[PDB]
Write a protein that holds these residues in place. Structure first.
Motif, PDB file in Angstrom:
ATOM      1  N   UNK A  54      -1.358  18.196   8.908  1.00 32.43           N
ATOM      2  CA  UNK A  54      -0.669  16.918   8.815  1.00 32.43           C
ATOM      3  C   UNK A  54      -1.696  15.796   8.735  1.00 32.43           C
ATOM      4  N   UNK A  55      -2.552  15.839   7.717  1.00 29.10           N
ATOM      5  CA  UNK A  55      -3.627  14.873   7.547  1.00 29.10           C
ATOM      6  C   UNK A  55      -3.367  14.098   6.264  1.00 29.10           C
ATOM      7  N   UNK A  56      -3.671  12.802   6.291  1.00 30.28           N
ATOM      8  CA  UNK A  56      -3.387  11.897   5.186  1.00 30.28           C
ATOM      9  C   UNK A  56      -4.677  11.199   4.775  1.00 30.28           C
ATOM     10  N   UNK A  57      -4.922  11.136   3.467  1.00 32.94           N
ATOM     11  CA  UNK A  57      -6.071  10.439   2.915  1.00 32.94           C
ATOM     12  C   UNK A  57      -5.618   9.309   1.999  1.00 32.94           C
ATOM     13  N   UNK A  58      -6.451   8.274   1.902  1.00 34.61           N
ATOM     14  CA  UNK A  58      -6.164   7.100   1.091  1.00 34.61           C
ATOM     15  C   UNK A  58      -7.278   6.874   0.078  1.00 34.61           C
ATOM     16  N   UNK A  59      -6.904   6.295  -1.060  1.00 35.47           N
ATOM     17  CA  UNK A  59      -7.820   5.961  -2.142  1.00 35.47           C
ATOM     18  C   UNK A  59      -7.948   4.445  -2.213  1.00 35.47           C
ATOM     19  N   UNK A  60      -9.173   3.943  -2.086  1.00 37.88           N
ATOM     20  CA  UNK A  60      -9.453   2.515  -2.151  1.00 37.88           C
ATOM     21  C   UNK A  60     -10.188   2.200  -3.444  1.00 37.88           C
ATOM     22  N   UNK A  61      -9.741   1.149  -4.131  1.00 40.52           N
ATOM     23  CA  UNK A  61     -10.315   0.813  -5.429  1.00 40.52           C
ATOM     24  C   UNK A  61     -11.719   0.237  -5.289  1.00 40.52           C
ATOM     25  N   UNK A  62     -11.919  -0.681  -4.349  1.00 40.78           N
ATOM     26  CA  UNK A  62     -13.223  -1.308  -4.142  1.00 40.78           C
ATOM     27  C   UNK A  62     -13.988  -0.607  -3.019  1.00 40.78           C
ATOM     28  N   UNK A  63     -14.194   0.695  -3.198  1.00 37.85           N
ATOM     29  CA  UNK A  63     -14.913   1.498  -2.222  1.00 37.85           C
ATOM     30  C   UNK A  63     -15.899   2.406  -2.940  1.00 37.85           C
ATOM     31  N   UNK A 121       0.652  26.825   8.305  1.00 38.10           N
ATOM     32  CA  UNK A 121      -0.343  25.797   8.016  1.00 38.10           C
ATOM     33  C   UNK A 121      -0.649  25.040   9.301  1.00 38.10           C
ATOM     34  N   UNK A 122      -1.808  25.330   9.897  1.00 37.50           N
ATOM     35  CA  UNK A 122      -2.230  24.598  11.087  1.00 37.50           C
ATOM     36  C   UNK A 122      -2.538  23.144  10.759  1.00 37.50           C
ATOM     37  N   UNK A 123      -3.160  22.895   9.608  1.00 40.44           N
ATOM     38  CA  UNK A 123      -3.527  21.544   9.191  1.00 40.44           C
ATOM     39  C   UNK A 123      -3.284  21.429   7.694  1.00 40.44           C
ATOM     40  N   UNK A 124      -2.291  20.635   7.308  1.00 42.40           N
ATOM     41  CA  UNK A 124      -1.939  20.427   5.908  1.00 42.40           C
ATOM     42  C   UNK A 124      -2.409  19.031   5.514  1.00 42.40           C
ATOM     43  N   UNK A 125      -3.213  18.957   4.457  1.00 45.98           N
ATOM     44  CA  UNK A 125      -3.877  17.724   4.054  1.00 45.98           C
ATOM     45  C   UNK A 125      -3.105  17.102   2.899  1.00 45.98           C
ATOM     46  N   UNK A 126      -2.692  15.849   3.060  1.00 47.03           N
ATOM     47  CA  UNK A 126      -1.755  15.215   2.141  1.00 47.03           C
ATOM     48  C   UNK A 126      -2.462  14.122   1.347  1.00 47.03           C
ATOM     49  N   UNK A 127      -2.346  14.200   0.022  1.00 47.37           N
ATOM     50  CA  UNK A 127      -2.846  13.195  -0.904  1.00 47.37           C
ATOM     51  C   UNK A 127      -1.736  12.880  -1.895  1.00 47.37           C
ATOM     52  N   UNK A 128      -1.595  11.607  -2.259  1.00 48.88           N
ATOM     53  CA  UNK A 128      -0.486  11.224  -3.122  1.00 48.88           C
ATOM     54  C   UNK A 128      -0.817   9.984  -3.939  1.00 48.88           C
ATOM     55  N   UNK A 129      -0.341   9.974  -5.180  1.00 50.79           N
ATOM     56  CA  UNK A 129      -0.174   8.760  -5.976  1.00 50.79           C
ATOM     57  C   UNK A 129       1.322   8.650  -6.240  1.00 50.79           C
ATOM     58  N   UNK A 130       1.968   7.677  -5.616  1.00 49.41           N
ATOM     59  CA  UNK A 130       3.420   7.646  -5.602  1.00 49.41           C
ATOM     60  C   UNK A 130       3.878   6.213  -5.403  1.00 49.41           C
ATOM     61  N   UNK A 131       5.112   5.892  -5.791  1.00 45.92           N
ATOM     62  CA  UNK A 131       5.675   4.587  -5.437  1.00 45.92           C
ATOM     63  C   UNK A 131       5.747   4.431  -3.928  1.00 45.92           C
ATOM     64  N   UNK A 132       5.611   3.184  -3.475  1.00 49.36           N
ATOM     65  CA  UNK A 132       5.631   2.913  -2.042  1.00 49.36           C
ATOM     66  C   UNK A 132       6.966   3.295  -1.418  1.00 49.36           C
ATOM     67  N   UNK A 164       0.848  -1.187   0.000  1.00 48.47           N
ATOM     68  CA  UNK A 164       0.000   0.000   0.000  1.00 48.47           C
ATOM     69  C   UNK A 164       0.886   1.239   0.000  1.00 48.47           C
ATOM     70  N   UNK A 165       0.674   2.118  -0.982  1.00 50.17           N
ATOM     71  CA  UNK A 165       1.473   3.336  -1.079  1.00 50.17           C
ATOM     72  C   UNK A 165       1.187   4.284   0.078  1.00 50.17           C
ATOM     73  N   UNK A 166      -0.084   4.429   0.454  1.00 44.73           N
ATOM     74  CA  UNK A 166      -0.438   5.372   1.509  1.00 44.73           C
ATOM     75  C   UNK A 166       0.000   4.883   2.882  1.00 44.73           C
ATOM     76  N   UNK A 167      -0.020   3.569   3.113  1.00 47.63           N
ATOM     77  CA  UNK A 167       0.380   3.043   4.412  1.00 47.63           C
ATOM     78  C   UNK A 167       1.866   3.243   4.684  1.00 47.63           C
ATOM     79  N   UNK A 168       2.672   3.465   3.644  1.00 43.58           N
ATOM     80  CA  UNK A 168       4.084   3.756   3.855  1.00 43.58           C
ATOM     81  C   UNK A 168       4.284   5.120   4.504  1.00 43.58           C
ATOM     82  N   UNK A 169       3.342   6.044   4.301  1.00 50.99           N
ATOM     83  CA  UNK A 169       3.426   7.350   4.949  1.00 50.99           C
ATOM     84  C   UNK A 169       3.376   7.207   6.464  1.00 50.99           C
ATOM     85  N   UNK A 170       2.436   6.405   6.965  1.00 51.36           N
ATOM     86  CA  UNK A 170       2.415   6.109   8.386  1.00 51.36           C
ATOM     87  C   UNK A 170       3.591   5.256   8.817  1.00 51.36           C
TER      88      UNK A 170
END
Lengths: 375, 286, 230
Positions: free
Chosen positions: C208-217, C187-198, C91-97
RNA sequence: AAAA
RNA sequence: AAAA
């Protein structure tokens, strides 16, 4: 070292083999394999058929009689030549010729024979009998096979993907575990290939083959071994040399568009557009055709640019837009459909609609959803 | 008499010595097949043997029977009398011999590749025979015999736009845009079928969407004709939806055979033989 | 410099074993003496321990992401610890955490082996370095759900990043741009979205907020799965 | 669009 | 965006 034959023991040109009757010095064994050995035994076995296991551990069970010329004459027992065996145990990638077919078993045998000849063009050591002997994959396992024409029911298509396709590559890769797999793939039903490639993924090296029917010889049209360029979206629309891409947005509020690909000959654009505007209520579209030579893509040249520019167009359509759902209607080569399913994968809300020839109107039907294949 | 057999195993690499050597050593073994008086069948088969000997002087019908077991009758789509216009007769004729003849003959010659040599007699039936054969067969379609269709992907080229049409002229006429069906008059034979087919579509089928494609130099290659025909078909199937296609065509046997090869069973296509009956439907070929 | 190949996967155990064997070969061509039997022998870290693993598909509920990060990931990179970590995840987004809590590799699929590529006060931090443009989707999610109008887009050779060299310039440029934006605007709250290699995602987490994209959602496809400041 |  |  240990070798099993219907067993032998090989120790590190005198290849002296011991036996209860009379110990003999098969010096040509040592000459063939470039190592002197003292062959052991546990029981007396008549007939000089223990040669092949000795020579194979020198260079699973083996059976055969060696010759000074290196030709083998009579579980692996269908080999003939020394080079075949050499490149069958000491290669790095095992070719796995997979063919998807729906019909009768005679044409399946013919198709597999042709695919075997194509693999032998690049791996002369390969053959189907040797494959089934060496690792156990028969012709049926490599075949995505079902008798007769697939019924035009999405349940039937999803079932066929489930029982066979969804685990075919996983099980075959598990079978040849220590060695990598050079998947040689051909298929029959073009829309099925999108699902087959989505379940295949972009994480598998693959020679996706298309046949030149002028010679009944397959051609390596998608070479993804020796694959990051598979997923290159750096191509801009002004830098398009193979595909011709249009993006129509008539309902910006609706997060729905129809993805239509026309790289074969039989034009699906009218039928798919009518299906979208009359059954799905969609006005946004992403239409991809050929630039110059529609209906013929050179099977000698590499087909990777086609998919590169297609994927670049697909992700450029997603630049300033959010698409809750994408609808895929394609006519395209079997190999190109497989490669596109490999590249796009399951990451987009794509419902693929198959065109059935022997079906009442509508001839389109959502046989599967690209994001729903992992469920 | 035990010489040739030993001689055979002295010429394997996998009347005349060249014939035996090329019989045991070639890969693209030819098979001349005629769709069809039995004496006229024998004459046409002898002519096909001569034509395939022009390119394969080592090949013979008796040699073919001795080496592969394929007799001349196996290569013959035979049956006595004129063809009745009834669709059941045509469907049974395809189902009996033509449906699995290619499968059986390729099964006989299992290791070697296959270069078919096809000749035929009846025009509108050539589409059914070609759909049975398919676009995946390395086939020379002949027409003294002269080979006119050399297919050993260019046959399926649809890139040719309507402006740069070298041979044929296409005129797609649509009068009922809400109706998803198309007439497919193809005029490349001898007599002009335009009026009869138009009256039949407007009378017995209520079709006002018709495609008109319109004696030919047999010496040249016949591929651009098929290319432009397929291009016209798929340019018609671009901004409109069609759920039924009906051929009313006159053309050489070779070109109808190749058109059945190219268009195939994919499109909803019912060919109506004219002496006007749906003797077969392409989607029902398989 | 003890090897420690940690891989995040979510699926069947057999594909996990295949991925593990590939990663083992990748360590082996750099540390020949290492093996998975060796890892379970000298250290005892068995193949599931080095696997950030979950059966099936990770559910698209935030509690699932927090449970995955806290139960395993938070104690994974800390308790498993000289040592050098080779990381590549699914998971690309889980690497951020994972990075927020060394050789970071990315798989080259032609030869099928990895390559060490690493050795209002609300804004949408945007990164597009994969081959699936999230700009439209993340922008629409910001405008319609989180009410965001200011963005920081990070984006050359797009969709192919040369997996035979160092990706450190990419992460360094991203860090420089983010720090420049922080200096320019608070920036009190910076919202992070990415399509990137893991791999680059893991490196960015390591940076410092992170969102994820799920294919089957179902829509919305993005949710705040966690905060990078938690 | 069922080896394009 | 689920080894990009």
């Amino acid at each position: 070292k240990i070798g099993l034959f219907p067993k032998v023991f090989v120790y590190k040109p005198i290849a002296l083999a011991i036996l209860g009757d009379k110990i003999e010095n098969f010096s040509y064994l040592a000459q063939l394999g470039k190592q002197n050995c003292l062959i052991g035994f546990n029981k007396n076995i008549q007939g000089n058929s223990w040669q092949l296991a000795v020579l194979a551990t020198l260079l699973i069970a083996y059976s055969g009689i060696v010759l000074p010329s290196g030709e083998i004459i009579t579980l692996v027992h269908r080999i003939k030549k020394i080079e075949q065996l050499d490149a069958w145990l000491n290669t790095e990638t095992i070719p796995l010729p997979v063919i998807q077919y729906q019909g009768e078993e005679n044409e399946l045998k013919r198709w597999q024979k042709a695919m075997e000849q194509k693999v032998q063009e690049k791996f002369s050591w390969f053959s189907y009998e040797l494959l089934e002997d060496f690792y156990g994959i028969t012709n049926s396992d490599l075949a995505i096979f079902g008798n007769g024409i697939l019924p035009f029911e999405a349940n039937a298509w999803q079932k066929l993907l489930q029982e066979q396709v969804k685990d075919k590559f996983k099980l075959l890769e598990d079978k040849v575990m220590p060695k990598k797999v050079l998947w040689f793939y051909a298929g029959q039903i073009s829309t099925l290939q999108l699902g087959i490639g989505a379940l295949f993924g972009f994480k598998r090296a693959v020679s996706i083959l298309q046949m030149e029917f002028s010679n009944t010889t397959y051609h390596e049209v998608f070479i993804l071994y020796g694959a990051r360029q598979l997923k290159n979206v750096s191509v801009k629309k002004e830098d398009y040399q193979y595909i011709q891409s249009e993006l129509l947005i008539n309902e910006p509020h609706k997060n729905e568009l129809g993805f239509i690909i026309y790289l074969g000959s039989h034009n699906p654009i009218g039928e798919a557009k009518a299906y979208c505007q009359k059954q799905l209520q969609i006005n946004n579209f992403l239409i991809i055709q050929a630039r110059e030579n529609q209906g013929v893509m050179e099977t000698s040249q590499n087909w990777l640019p086609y998919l590169q520019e297609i994927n670049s167009a697909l992700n450029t359509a997603r630049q300033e837009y959010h698409w809750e759902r994408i609808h895929l209607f394609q006519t395209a080569p079997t190999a190109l459909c497989m490669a596109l399913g490999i590249a796009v994968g399951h990451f987009l809300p794509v419902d693929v609609y198959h065109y059935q020839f022997n079906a009442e109107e509508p001839k389109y039907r959502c046989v599967f959803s690209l994001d729903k294949m992992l469920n | 008499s035990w010489q040739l057999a030993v001689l055979a195993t002295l010429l394997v690499k996998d009347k005349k010595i060249e014939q035996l050597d090329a019989w045991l050593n070639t890969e693209t073994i030819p098979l001349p097949v005629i769709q069809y008086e039995e004496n006229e069948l024998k004459r046409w088969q002898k002519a096909m043997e001569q034509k395939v000997q022009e390119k394969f002087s080592w090949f013979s019908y008796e040699l073919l029977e001795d080496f592969y077991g394929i007799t001349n009758s196996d290569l013959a789509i035979f049956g006595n009398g004129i063809l009745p216009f009834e669709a059941n007769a045509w469907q049974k004729l395809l189902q009996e011999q033509v449906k699995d003849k290619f499968k059986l003959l390729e099964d006989k010659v299992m290791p070697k590749k296959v270069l078919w040599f096809y000749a035929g007699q009846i025009s509108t039936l050539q589409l059914g025979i070609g759909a049975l054969f398919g676009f995946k067969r390395a086939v020379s379609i002949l027409q003294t015999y002269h080979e006119v269709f050399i297919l050993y992907r260019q046959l399926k080229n649809v890139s040719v736009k309507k402006e740069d049409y070298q041979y044929i002229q296409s005129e797609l006429l649509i009068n009922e845009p809400h109706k998803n069906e198309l007439g497919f008059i193809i005029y490349l034979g001898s007599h002009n079928p335009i009026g009869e087919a138009k009256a039949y579509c407007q009378k017995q089928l209520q079709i006002n969407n018709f495609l008109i494609i319109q004696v030919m130099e047999t010496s040249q290659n016949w591929l651009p004709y098929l290319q432009e025909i397929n291009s016209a078909l798929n340019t018609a199937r671009q901004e409109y939806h069609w759920e039924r296609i009906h051929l009313f065509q006159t053309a050489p046997t070779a070109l109808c055979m190749a058109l059945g090869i190219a268009v195939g069973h994919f499109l909803p296509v019912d060919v109506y033989h004219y002496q006007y009956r749906c003797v077969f439907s392409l989607d029902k070929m398989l």
